[PDB]
Enzyme design. Structure first.
Site, mmCIF file in Angstrom:
data_model
loop_
_atom_site.group_PDB
_atom_site.id
_atom_site.type_symbol
_atom_site.label_atom_id
_atom_site.label_comp_id
_atom_site.label_asym_id
_atom_site.label_seq_id
_atom_site.Cartn_x
_atom_site.Cartn_y
_atom_site.Cartn_z
ATOM 1 N N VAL A 133 63.564 49.446 78.978
ATOM 2 C CA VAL A 133 62.758 48.514 78.253
ATOM 3 C C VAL A 133 63.630 47.330 77.745
ATOM 4 O O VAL A 133 63.183 46.179 77.722
ATOM 5 C CB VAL A 133 61.980 49.177 77.098
ATOM 6 C CG1 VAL A 133 61.138 48.090 76.413
ATOM 7 C CG2 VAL A 133 61.088 50.329 77.596
ATOM 8 N N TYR A 134 64.878 47.616 77.410
ATOM 9 C CA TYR A 134 65.809 46.570 77.032
ATOM 10 C C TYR A 134 66.001 45.514 78.156
ATOM 11 O O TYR A 134 65.900 44.314 77.912
ATOM 12 C CB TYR A 134 67.140 47.165 76.620
ATOM 13 C CG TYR A 134 68.101 46.102 76.236
ATOM 14 C CD1 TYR A 134 67.895 45.335 75.107
ATOM 15 C CD2 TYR A 134 69.199 45.812 77.033
ATOM 16 C CE1 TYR A 134 68.790 44.330 74.752
ATOM 17 C CE2 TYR A 134 70.085 44.817 76.672
ATOM 18 C CZ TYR A 134 69.859 44.095 75.530
ATOM 19 O OH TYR A 134 70.678 43.044 75.206
#
Lengths: 240, 240, 240, 234
Positions: free
Chosen positions: C154-155
């Site tokens: 997700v980063y």
């Protein structure tokens, strides 16, 4: 103690601007290309800002692969250099079917094979020297290496070639304190930009890039320590 | 009739696998390589699945740019081909300092110079023939062209050169109904990937890639019409 | 005339280093983040080097999209800024299966949604202002946006989203005199890369990158005029 | 024996073309989308070619992150799937300065936030299931995620976000037998004169499905984009 930089194609255009900037920064600049009169004229204009800083000319046929690899005629040993800027290049535009064999093959040798040979010569000479701060090898590439255009098949090939060479060298030479990058110009106000002009491309920033913009990128790289394996693109948005 | 495909390096490994699938899809396949004996064996193996499908050999030295550019020895006219797969290549591993000039220079020639020449002959011969479906030119590159590794300097340069050639051709030849792409293999099981093996890379999927998976990508491309300027990476996640 | 720079996440690590360097160049700097005490301590250290140069703080919760979008609580209107550096961001490591929903959704908001709102407001405020030299929008991204690694799904998405935003805006705003770029740091010494260190990545240059190295690329960009739609990577070779 | 595939936005355009082709290859396709009447029409026409193949519909609001995350109202548990195609998505064109906040936030949610949630639910349910060949997670992206154009800021961001997710997942999940890729369409019939294209014209939906199918039958492709964009990104 003035560090040594080698700039091929140092006598004109982008390479002159680079050499001028690196000289203003205190680097002892060797400029290499064919025309001895042109080289001398640039060398006179190179600033001398630190005591012990000396400039040099190297009359070097950029299309002679054995001369480049043998470092033939050079004013200093290959082992003297902490900065090597490969700015050496020829541009040619043509549909591929009509591209004369002597021409595209010459372009490939100037833009790729010779710089490979030069680069080998440099790396062999400086790899195991002690450092504390990384040496830098920087190639001048082109937006066309990354975003294709009609009529530059071989030109594009030669400099995409240089990009792939850079990326692998970066991985190889990183542990030895040598950092390896490309600067990628767009359409810049020079010769070999004879014929081509900015309005031929869909640019977010319209018009010419000046040669000093490309040198700013080279200078930035030379002063950096944690940049390797990258391209700095100075192309008015061509590759966006 | 049955469309003609030319496949260089077609006598073993990936090129053999590409020629087999193309034959299986009804293509009349010309296979070119140095070793006539290995070529004839491959030819005998190639499926024949429809009437008026015929396969051929072309003894072609992959390091002779002139021969390649003149279609010297070819069994059909360059104008016959609707598919050209430039599978020809040599891989060499060496620290760049230690890379013998004769070796890396032959590799660049085999991997880049000769294919450019050969591509020029094909494009010259087919650019004007009429088509309602695109013709295909497909280069076999490598993961190492896009993600750098130690000891593969010139190898990487040659194949990134091909990538650059590809993008620019795709732009140039698009409006001519010719689609131009690369297939980029990872570590594939061939007497070609010699000594170097999958463990030597950081791979999301461990182990060898079989030659048939490379050929799958080529076959996919040959049957497509809206795919140009691209790479299909079959590399077990190497470039991720 | 002193130009105004807005720097979000401006109160420590990379953001603080960028703010310090821009102030040393003569910019009037507004540093924006959540933590007021840290803000004020940084402001007090910002060099004041010319006449008319003033610095400010903006207490802003960088998770509040509406507050970012409306310049809620800001010391100057959006229309004042010639430079906007979006350094605002959170990093989180977790297998995707185990990444708690609240956390990754909050990361997405801080890293992507709120900067999009902030950018929208700057762009709407400055787009029709006349300019001799270009305005700059610079996002801080990450090597992970371009080369994949485990446990940062997700980063990487959030920061790749930023990259994607950057290229399109570059094309959109170039004709309005606004240059848009990313700086992409590698593993950088900050109380932010917590858990993660350089040893978990295959790096050509071992070790931590210092915050000043990231600021130097920002400063380079801010002083340039022909760079847009690009990334400047300062990652010790992660993306090579 | 027929494997389960999930295709979101499976009722119209590219998703329908994908559902159709996967069905033709033997997969039991579950299609998920808001429009329940169109879902049944497509489920009615999906090929049946394998013993035991059965198709399914799932009424899903593709903007409801929590329903995506929890497989709310799904006909099969998340554990049943060997293929997940994330086709789900909205495109919007506006100068960034005039882009309505409710519009671009909703696009981000549909294109990025909800597909992450769905991906999580799938990866959680399948990561430890034994496998002989790999499972597949395929996102539909866009040429605009890699090459910038005006008036598509947020759309581009949402889809480049997907690309970045795909690359990390591919590294994370490869050891678990899950391959993760994107297919990037150009301007597909569902305008092309907006763009500089080496091949003029629209791309038909089936050309996009061809890519997905190729991916699905492959074993050694992960971390990549297959671009079917008429040369947009060349």
């Amino acid at each position: 103690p003035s560090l040594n930089a080698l700039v091929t194609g140092g006598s004109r255009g982008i390479g002159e601007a680079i050499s001028m900037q690196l000289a203003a920064e205190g680097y002892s600049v060797t400029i290499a290309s064919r025309g001895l009169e042109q080289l001398e004229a640039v060398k006179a204009k190179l600033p001398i800002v630190k005591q012990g800083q000396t400039h040099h000319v190297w009359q070097l046929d950029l299309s002679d692969v054995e001369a480049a690899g043998s470092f033939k005629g050079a004013p200093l040993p290959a082992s003297s250099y902490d900065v090597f800027v490969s700015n050496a290049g020829i541009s040619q535009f043509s549909p591929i079917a009509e591209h004369a064999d002597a021409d595209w093959q010459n372009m490939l040798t100037v833009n790729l094979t010779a710089p490979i040979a030069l680069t080998k010569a440099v790396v062999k000479a400086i790899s195991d020297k002690p450092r504390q701060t990384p040496a830098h090898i920087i190639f001048i590439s082109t937006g066309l290496s990354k975003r294709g255009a009609p009529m530059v098949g071989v030109y594009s090939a030669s400099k995409a070639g240089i990009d792939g060479f850079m990326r692998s060298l970066a991985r190889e030479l990183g542990p030895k304190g040598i950092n390896v990058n490309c600067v990628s110009p767009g359409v810049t106000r020079t010769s070999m930009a004879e014929g081509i002009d900015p309005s031929m491309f869909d640019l977010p920033i319209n018009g010419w890039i000046e040669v000093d913009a490309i040198a700013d990128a080279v200078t930035y790289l030379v002063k950096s320590k944690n940049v390797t394996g990258t391209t700095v693109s100075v192309d008015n948005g061509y590759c966006a």
